[PDB]
Amino acid sequence: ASPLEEDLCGYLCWITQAE
Amino acid sequence: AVRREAERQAQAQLEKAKTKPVAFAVRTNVRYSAAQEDDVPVPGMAISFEAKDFLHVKEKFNNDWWIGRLVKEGCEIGFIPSPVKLENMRLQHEQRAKFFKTPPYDVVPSMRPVVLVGPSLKGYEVTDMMQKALFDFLKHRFEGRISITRVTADISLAKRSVLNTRSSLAEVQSEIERIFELARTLQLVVLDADTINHPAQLSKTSLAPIIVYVKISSPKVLQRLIKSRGKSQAKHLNVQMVAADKLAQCPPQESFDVILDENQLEDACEHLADYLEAYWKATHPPSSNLPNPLLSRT
Numbered sequence: 437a438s439p440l441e442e443d444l445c446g447y448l449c450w451i452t453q454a455e
Numbered sequence: 456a457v458r459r460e461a462e463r464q465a466q467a468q469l470e471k472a473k474t475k476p477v478a479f480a481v482r483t484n485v486r487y488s489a490a491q492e493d494d495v496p497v498p499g500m501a502i503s504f505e506a507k508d509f510l511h512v513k514e515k516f517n518n519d520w521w522i523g524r525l526v527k528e529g530c531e532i533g534f535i536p537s538p539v540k541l542e543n544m545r546l547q548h549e550q551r552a553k554f555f556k557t558p559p560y561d562v563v564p565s566m567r568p569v570v571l572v573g574p575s576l577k578g579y580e581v582t583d584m585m586q587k588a589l590f591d592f593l594k595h596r597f598e599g600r601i602s603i604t605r606v607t608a609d610i611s612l613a614k615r616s617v618l619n620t621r622s623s624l625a626e627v628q629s630e631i632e633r634i635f636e637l638a639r640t641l642q643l644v645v646l647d648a649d650t651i652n653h654p655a656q657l658s659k660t661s662l663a664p665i666i667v668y669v670k671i672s673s674p675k676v677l678q679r680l681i682k683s684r685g686k687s688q689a690k691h692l693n694v695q696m697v698a699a700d701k702l703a704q705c706p707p708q709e710s711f712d713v714i715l716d717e718n719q720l721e722d723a724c725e726h727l728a729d730y731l732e733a734y735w736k737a738t739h740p741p742s743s744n745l746p747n748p749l750l751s752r753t
């Protein structure tokens with residue numbers, strides 16, 4: 437994946453860990 | 456001879472202060488570079504410092520000298536000039552140098568409270584959820600050593616300029632006083648401060664926070680994260696993007712203590728934990744308690 441897609445995936449995963 | 460005896464009584468006081476508690480902390484507004492002519496109670500034992508440095512003060516030695524240390528790993532206690540002494544030295548310089556035309560120390564919490572800002576505004580899902588994961592991590596990682604507390608009062612109002620009902624301003628002051636008290640015994644203090652989105656909002660207070668910038672480097676990524684939370688969040692895109700851009704416009708070295716620009720929660724957490732462990736070491740020098748030998752020599 438592109439750096440921006442990798443950023444996005446990492447942050448979406450971070451958000452899921454908050455639930 | 457009267458003087459060697461005076462140095463001895465001073466050294467001895469210094470010895471005893473190593474294991475005393477921290478009475479208070481200051482942030483310096485001025486620099487001090489010790490010189491032999493300052494007449495230090497023990498020659499060579501003065502604490503020099505730059506402006507914006509932090510000192511932990513144990514006790515008052517006399518009107519001219521306190522006893523304390525720079526909040527930095529490896530630094531041990533010594534003699535810190537009192538404001539009276541700093542003003543006397545300032546006038547000595549002015550006298551040596553020579554109609555219509557600044558305190559050297561601010562008292563701050565003994566442990567600087569940690570405050571999280573970014574990636575955008577609090578009270579919206581992206582920032583709330585991202586920060587919640589960091590606070591959850593801190594609670595588990597620093598168990599036994601940390602107090603994490605919410606602050607709903609608007610602590611940006613805690614300046615002399617201000618410092619609104621009388622009741623709300625008293626509540627701001629009581630929250631300041633609580634945060635100072637939480638830090639008194641040298642536990643780490645973490646605030647979830649609802650109203651603070653930008654470091655300039657605390658820069659004029661006496662809290663001297665550790666500002667943690669949770670930074671999303673690309674605005675395109677932020678935008679897409681907001682959109683991931685659905686149309687109910689995305690309708691607030693603009694205010695969230697403007698707020699993130701204001702953080703990005705700050706001079707970073709002066710505005711933020713730690714910048715978490717990692718895109719993995721694990722890596723952002725370990726960076727913050729490493730920072731706070733280093734801060735623990737700076738504030739908790741081993742000299743602050745003597746070992747109590749298991750075995751005697753005879």
Ligand SMILES: *Cc1cccc(C*)c1
Nearest residue numbers: 445446448449450452
């Ligand atoms: C993008 C993504 C892949 C796998 C797991 C998560 C949490 C997110």
Ligand SMILES: [Cl-]
Nearest residue numbers: 515517518537
């Ligand atoms: Cl005093």
